[PDB]
Copies of this chain bind each other. A is one copy, B any other.
Amino acid sequence: PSYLSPGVYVEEVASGSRPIEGVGTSVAAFVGLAPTGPLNEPTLVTNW
């Protein structure tokens, strides 16, 4: 950092812990034909 004037400076050192988390692997995409509904749009469903 740059110090040019008297005073009190508070800085945070980046040294620490940065945990890495997993990802969800339970999503599937089905392509098919249906009688009625949105066309060419990847709709999201979570219950019948």
Q: Report which A residues bind B (CB closer than 8 A).
A: 2-4, 22, 24-26
Contact = CB atoms under 8 A, between A and B. Distances in A.
Q: How many copies does the complex hold?
A: 2
Closest 6 A/B residue pairs (Cβ): A4-B24, A2-B24, A2-B26, A2-B25, A2-B22, A3-B22
Nearest to A5: B24
A5 to B, nearest CB: 10
A26 B4 CA distance: 11
Contacts of A22: 2-3
Contacts of A24: 2, 4
A37 B2 CA distance: 33
Contacts of A25: 2
